[PDB]
Amino acid sequence: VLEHGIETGIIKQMPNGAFIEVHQPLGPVDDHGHPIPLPYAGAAVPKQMNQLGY
Amino acid sequence: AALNRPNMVSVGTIVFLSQELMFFAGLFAMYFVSRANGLANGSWGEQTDHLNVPYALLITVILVSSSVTCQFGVFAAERGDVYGLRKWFLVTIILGSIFVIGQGYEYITLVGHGLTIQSSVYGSAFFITTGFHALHVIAGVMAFVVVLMRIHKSKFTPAQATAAMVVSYYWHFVDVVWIGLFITIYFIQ
Amino acid sequence: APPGGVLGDFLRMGWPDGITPEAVAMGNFWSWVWVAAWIIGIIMWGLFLTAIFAWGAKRAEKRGEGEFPKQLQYNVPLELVLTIVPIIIVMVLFFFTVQTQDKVTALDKNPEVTVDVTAYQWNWKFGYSEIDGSLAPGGQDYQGSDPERQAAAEASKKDPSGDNPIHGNSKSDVSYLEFNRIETLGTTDEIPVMVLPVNTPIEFNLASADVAHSFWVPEFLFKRDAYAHPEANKSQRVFQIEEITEEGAFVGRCAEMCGTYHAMMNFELRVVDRDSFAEYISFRDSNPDATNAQALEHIGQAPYATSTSPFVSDRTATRDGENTQ
Amino acid sequence: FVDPAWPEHNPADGHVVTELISKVAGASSPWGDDKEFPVSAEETGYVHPYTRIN
Amino acid sequence: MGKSFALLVLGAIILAGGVWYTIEVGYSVMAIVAALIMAAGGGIITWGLAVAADVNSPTSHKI
Amino acid sequence: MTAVAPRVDGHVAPQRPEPTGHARKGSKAWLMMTTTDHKQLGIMYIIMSFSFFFLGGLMALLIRAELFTPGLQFLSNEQFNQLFTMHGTVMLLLYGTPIVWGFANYVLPLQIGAPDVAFPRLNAFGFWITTVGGVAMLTGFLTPGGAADFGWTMYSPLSDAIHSPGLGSDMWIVGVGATGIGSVASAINMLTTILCLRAPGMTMFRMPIFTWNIFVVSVLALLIFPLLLAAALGVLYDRKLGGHLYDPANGGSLLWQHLFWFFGHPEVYVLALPFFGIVSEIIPVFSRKPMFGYVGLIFATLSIGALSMAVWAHHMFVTGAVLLPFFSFMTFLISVPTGVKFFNWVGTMWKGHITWETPMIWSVGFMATFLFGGLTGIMLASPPLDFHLADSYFLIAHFHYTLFGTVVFASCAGVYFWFPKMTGRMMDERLGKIHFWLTFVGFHGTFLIQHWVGNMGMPRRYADYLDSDGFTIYNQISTVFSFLLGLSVIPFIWNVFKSWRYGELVTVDDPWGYGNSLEWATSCPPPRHNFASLPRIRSERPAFELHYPHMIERMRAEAHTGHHDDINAPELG
Amino acid sequence: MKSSAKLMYGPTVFMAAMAVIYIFATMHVSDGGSVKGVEWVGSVALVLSAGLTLMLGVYLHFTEVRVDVLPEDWEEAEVADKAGTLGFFSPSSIWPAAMSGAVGFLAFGVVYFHYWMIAVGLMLLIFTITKLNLQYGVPKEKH
Numbered sequence A: 001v002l003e004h005g006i007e008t009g010i011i012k013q014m015p016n017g018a019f020i021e022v023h024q025p026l027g028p029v030d031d032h033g034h035p036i037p038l039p040y041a042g043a044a045v046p047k048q049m050n051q052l053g054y
Numbered sequence B: 001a002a003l004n005r006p007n008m009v010s011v012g013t014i015v016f017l018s019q020e021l022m023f024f025a026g027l028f029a030m031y032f033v034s035r036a037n038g039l040a041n042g043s044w045g046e047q048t049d050h051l052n053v054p055y056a057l058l059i060t061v062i063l064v065s066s067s068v069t070c071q072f073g074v075f076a077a078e079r080g081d082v083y084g085l086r087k088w089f090l091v092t093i094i095l096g097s098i099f100v101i102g103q104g105y106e107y108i109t110l111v112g113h114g115l116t117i118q119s120s121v122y123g124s125a126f127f128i129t130t131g132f133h134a135l136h137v138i139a140g141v142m143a144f145v146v147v148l149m150r151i152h153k154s155k156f157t158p159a160q161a162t163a164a165m166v167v168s169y170y171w172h173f174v175d176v177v178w179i180g181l182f183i184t185i186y187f188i189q
Numbered sequence C: 001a002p003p004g005g006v007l008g009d010f011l012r013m014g015w016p017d018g019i020t021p022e023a024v025a026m027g028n029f030w031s032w033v034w035v036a037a038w039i040i041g042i043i044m045w046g047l048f049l050t051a052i053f054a055w056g057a058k059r060a061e062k063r064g065e066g067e068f069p070k071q072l073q074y075n076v077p078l079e080l081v082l083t084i085v086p087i088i089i090v091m092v093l094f095f096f097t098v099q100t101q102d103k104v105t106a107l108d109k110n111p112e113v114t115v116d117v118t119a120y121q122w123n124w125k126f127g128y129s130e131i132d133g134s135l136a137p138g139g140q141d142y143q144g145s146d147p148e149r150q151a152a153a154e155a156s157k158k159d160p161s162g163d164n165p166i167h168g169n170s171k172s173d174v175s176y177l178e179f180n181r182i183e184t185l186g187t188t189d190e191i192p193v194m195v196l197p198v199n200t201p202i203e204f205n206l207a208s209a210d211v212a213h214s215f216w217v218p219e220f221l222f223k224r225d226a227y228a229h230p231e232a233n234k235s236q237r238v239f240q241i242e243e244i245t246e247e248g249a250f251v252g253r254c255a256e257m258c259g260t261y262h263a264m265m266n267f268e269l270r271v272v273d274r275d276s277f278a279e280y281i282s283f284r285d286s287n288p289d290a291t292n293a294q295a296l297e298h299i300g301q302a303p304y305a306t307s308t309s310p311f312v313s314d315r316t317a318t319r320d321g322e323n324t325q
Numbered sequence D: 001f002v003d004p005a006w007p008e009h010n011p012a013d014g015h016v017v018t019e020l021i022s023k024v025a026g027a028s029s030p031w032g033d034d035k036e037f038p039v040s041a042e043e044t045g046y047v048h049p050y051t052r053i054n
Numbered sequence E: 001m002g003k004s005f006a007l008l009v010l011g012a013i014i015l016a017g018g019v020w021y022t023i024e025v026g027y028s029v030m031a032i033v034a035a036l037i038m039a040a041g042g043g044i045i046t047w048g049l050a051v052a053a054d055v056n057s058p059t060s061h062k063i
Numbered sequence F: 001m002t003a004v005a006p007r008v009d010g011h012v013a014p015q016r017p018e019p020t021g022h023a024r025k026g027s028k029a030w031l032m033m034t035t036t037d038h039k040q041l042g043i044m045y046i047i048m049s050f051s052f053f054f055l056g057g058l059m060a061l062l063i064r065a066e067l068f069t070p071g072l073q074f075l076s077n078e079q080f081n082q083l084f085t086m087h088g089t090v091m092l093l094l095y096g097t098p099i100v101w102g103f104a105n106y107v108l109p110l111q112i113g114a115p116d117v118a119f120p121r122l123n124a125f126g127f128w129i130t131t132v133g134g135v136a137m138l139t140g141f142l143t144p145g146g147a148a149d150f151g152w153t154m155y156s157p158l159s160d161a162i163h164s165p166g167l168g169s170d171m172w173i174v175g176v177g178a179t180g181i182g183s184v185a186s187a188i189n190m191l192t193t194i195l196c197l198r199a200p201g202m203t204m205f206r207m208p209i210f211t212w213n214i215f216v217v218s219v220l221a222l223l224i225f226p227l228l229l230a231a232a233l234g235v236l237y238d239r240k241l242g243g244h245l246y247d248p249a250n251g252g253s254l255l256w257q258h259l260f261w262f263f264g265h266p267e268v269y270v271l272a273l274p275f276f277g278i279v280s281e282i283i284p285v286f287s288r289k290p291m292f293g294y295v296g297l298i299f300a301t302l303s304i305g306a307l308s309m310a311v312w313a314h315h316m317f318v319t320g321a322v323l324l325p326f327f328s329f330m331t332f333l334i335s336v337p338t339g340v341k342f343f344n345w346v347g348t349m350w351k352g353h354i355t356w357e358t359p360m361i362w363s364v365g366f367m368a369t370f371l372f373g374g375l376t377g378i379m380l381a382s383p384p385l386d387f388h389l390a391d392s393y394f395l396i397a398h399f400h401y402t403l404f405g406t407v408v409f410a411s412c413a414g415v416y417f418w419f420p421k422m423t424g425r426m427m428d429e430r431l432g433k434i435h436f437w438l439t440f441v442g443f444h445g446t447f448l449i450q451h452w453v454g455n456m457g458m459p460r461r462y463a464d465y466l467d468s469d470g471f472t473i474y475n476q477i478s479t480v481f482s483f484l485l486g487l488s489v490i491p492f493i494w495n496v497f498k499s500w501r502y503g504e505l506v507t508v509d510d511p512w513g514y515g516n517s518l519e520w521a522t523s524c525p526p527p528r529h530n531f532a533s534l535p536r537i538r539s540e541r542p543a544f545e546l547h548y549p550h551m552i553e554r555m556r557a558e559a560h561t562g563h564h565d566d567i568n569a570p571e572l573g
Numbered sequence G: 001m002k003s004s005a006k007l008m009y010g011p012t013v014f015m016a017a018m019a020v021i022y023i024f025a026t027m028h029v030s031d032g033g034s035v036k037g038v039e040w041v042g043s044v045a046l047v048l049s050a051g052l053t054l055m056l057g058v059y060l061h062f063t064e065v066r067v068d069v070l071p072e073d074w075e076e077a078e079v080a081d082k083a084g085t086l087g088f089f090s091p092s093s094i095w096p097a098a099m100s101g102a103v104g105f106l107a108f109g110v111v112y113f114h115y116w117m118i119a120v121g122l123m124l125l126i127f128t129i130t131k132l133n134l135q136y137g138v139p140k141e142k143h
Ligand code: HAS
Pocket: C033, C036, C037, C038, C040, C044, C085, C086, C087, C089, C090, C093, F153, F268, F269, F271, F272, F314, F315, F316, F317, F318, F331, F334, F335, F336, F338, F339, F340, F342, F370, F371, F373, F374, F375, F376, F377, F378, F379, F380, F381, F382, F386, F389, F390, F391, F395, F398, F399, F400, F402, F403, F406
């Protein structure tokens, strides 16, 4: 989760046909998604999108 | 446009309801076989004198009423009315919970004047068929309550609407099975 | 009409020669069906073998082939000729099937002796119900049913204390059973022998005390399930044979799972001369205190089963292969 | 009455969900089908908890 | 071809041992053990045959 | 038309995910508890099935060891009776039916171009209920009395409160019921993914034969499993309470027999059609020829869908309670579609280029076995022949050529076939061939002469026999070859274990070369969502046209017998 | 599913025809290898077996009327036609395993015929089914 983000349940199909899952980053991203990996902090990380009140 | 296409959850639930119908194929088979050789020696007639046909009609209309209210609740979900769904589902829960109490009371008043599982083949066949249906009705009521407490926490998107529509499918199936089961037991004898 | 000798022997696959005209018909049908089945199997296997020895990868390299040769997928003309052929085969086979099955399932053979077979856990019990006046004790048609012993069963229909759950009858209504005068009872250490005449139409009446059993005689090439309350189950409890052609002792087994000692309830058929059988019946009728073995000795037969032996009941014995008595 | 979270659709020649048809091939998203993901890490309101042990 | 013939001969001798061993122990518990012996023998023979029939038409090459 | 996209500069390749050799601690422990991926679920669904195979087959050896010689050497009547009950049950419901859904969970979403199954959390429930049912059923052995001892058919009134008392008989009922929920929970979402979740351009008639077979099985399993649950809950209601539904005095015996066999034979054909599909996948790829009579196969599979429902009392010819002409004829019909789809296999191999890898070896070693199994099936379908053969030992030989035919030969074929797809590694060929030859010789040896003994008068469920019967040499031969059959799993287990972590790495998305299914257009293994890109589907073989463009005109021009004159037809608007 | 709704009519009409043949042939034919009279298991369960196929067939038929031409149902469709969202699939959940454990508890409850065990197993099953459905609904923790 810290490396890639919350696994949202939105399986989009890209124009090429690649099935991709939408990931919600909890941290800043670099250039094109791929979030900067947040270091472990000894606390509970959210795992679902409802845990962020969505 | 958005290129509309079949509801996946609805098709999944219909395919589930089909198999639940063959579950009652077994029960109906057991009832009809026991009826066939019960008529043979003229013993069936004596056993069906324990039936309260008028009382079984009142609960029937109650269950049919529950179905109609259920449909009204679903008519409210298509339009995103949270409160329309909330109201009619509560009335359906109330209507469907008095069927179970009503059905339960019939059992209590039936074992009082002779008919039990361990008393006749008729008794065993009556309670197997009507008992499993009662379990299904309880399951349906619990489905309603969980849908009610599901739309209490979530934001009521089409996802919650779909959940409500499929639970209504289950309820309609249950009451249709009852309609078919009441004719078999109380009318055809 | 079996095909030839040794070949005919091969086609049987250990099927008993059969001692009954019914068995003969079934045997013939079986032999011919196997002749056809072997042919079809040979063709199918032949094609599977040619797939190995003819159509190969680097078999097709000497000829400068390559890959993807003749990529056909739909031979419509040869597709409606290979659907029809199995249909014709199965129809012509079914004709003979229904033709043959009519012989055995017929109930109009005019039997001259009826036997009441009663299967229980775990043995057999035979009783001579009717015997034709010809091979009878006196000449009047033998009528084997017990007056008071059967009427006591007929009275088990209702429980004196309130218990009539099964369609207003006692749960333990043992009235479908038939009790007779001349009865051979099989003990755990005495194989029941049913004595029958030769060249006579026999009828068998099957019922079970408790659970489903199966009256199987390998020499008859026939078996039938005996069911408790056969009428309620809507199973025909009666089957008949034209005659028995052979003379001797023939095994019979229970070919239906019925509890533990299922492998251990075997009976014997002793087919004896007509006159001899009559004499047997006379002796056992006039001596109601006698035993089956004594009656068998009376007519010069072996007193005990020759094709079968009782099993030794001791569990922790038989380890050395000595399981007979 | 129409729920705030109900997707903003024209009530003319179009229905978002009925008994048997829908707009997606699969289950509708429980966080709004019209919600665009992912979002900035700020909107999630997740506070990465800096911790130091000893 | 090398491994094959060795496996065939070993299997054959084990199987022969088993067949011989059955005859002494009549209908005892040891008949089961002798059955295991012949089964192992037959297994080894078929293993030898299988390796023989693989080095004839191989489908995997050593890199 | 085709709408060729512009050549984008920079596009290199997908990630090409790593094979299964390199797994770290904790990478699988909690993942498998909560997984909803059909890939991992299918893998564990197959593994569990094979575990139960090994466990349930050990019972067959104990049975087979006892029958070596007359007399009770180590096993009793009670222990022998409950040993074929649990052998026939674990092998049919704990190995057979699951292994069907394992090949269904893995490759069906991968064959239609779906990202996932329709109900990911439901098939995850279908796996966990089946295992629980299995564990519940086998708890009978942990009771002093033992497991259920009535057979796998639980006939009445042998299986009532009076006869066969003890908690093992309840455990059997309940375990069967539970394992039957897993089958319907899996059939729900094997039927709705086909409807809903399909790749652009994959029409219903572009789907492989495998998916058509699982389609038909799904609709066929929805109407049989509930019926069994109803019948078994009727028996439990009779046993636990004081119900009289199954008393002999009102049907009871026949009632159960009808109710059981009505699902008895449909469950039998839920074990055959998917494996016919598996074989129908393997033959075309190794023959470099398309699946002969594709629509023919569709119609054949659809026929067996409907016909299988009308043939159930051919299992009870000797009861003397059923209409012999009706069921005798109906059974003769169900051999006709099988014959059709069996000629189609020969047609596919006809004048092909066959390479003999392990999958093709297994598939061909299948047809030779199942053929004889089915041949002696039409024997039993005629009542004049079934009178002698019913409830006997010829029957035992018959349904071991068809069960051990389909669920073993074709299952193993499927394992060798799809192993590179599932794991990114390949199985040892030499060990695969050793396994095949062992399991082949060891099977035919143990089951051929089984026919002969059954005809000469040995019935099936017999703990013991007498020396004065002649069934000594035959039992001895069968036992010897059965112990050989039991050893064949040693190469299989070693192959699977070794090759899982050390097998040769797959570096191409189609290791078998000429794969023509949508699963062979992806990396080995696929990247968690089945597809890093999706091709154009224009026929039933999208991966073949993808890999071999130079022959797309050849596979259309000579696909038909002749009179094909559309290549010279004017264009449409 | 254009063709899916249609192919169910095949089995439906087949089983409907067999069920009516079965009833009439079993109650009016005396074979000698059986008795005469309608069989009440092969009749009810084969009439109602056709019912399942009819139900599914009719439902899919009504559904397929009011669906547009989907790319998966189009013979010459580009891969880029379905480019969009394929709805919501659950990534993971522990509740399937739990509720299998719950059905196992009720199963053994019925086996041993212990009332407390049946009752606990029943309410241990309601809980897990409820949690399965409310998994993505559990509100953000309010302090
Ligand atoms: C997956 C494994 C299995 C499949 C598939 C299967 C399908 C059939 N079965 Fe079966 N079965 C029986 C016979 C058949 C027939 C005719 C077919 C059909 O599927 C066969 C299809 C036909 C073929 C596979 C042949 C294809 C080959 C060619 C070449 C095509 C053309 C052939 C033609 C046209 C025939 C012409 C041939 C001639 C020789 C004229 C009978 C008796 O008629 C019983 C009950 C016995 C009793 O009385 O208790 C039975 C019950 C069972 C049982 C349990 C029995 C028990 O009592 O517990 C198992 C485990 C089993 C295995 C399997 N069975 N079967």
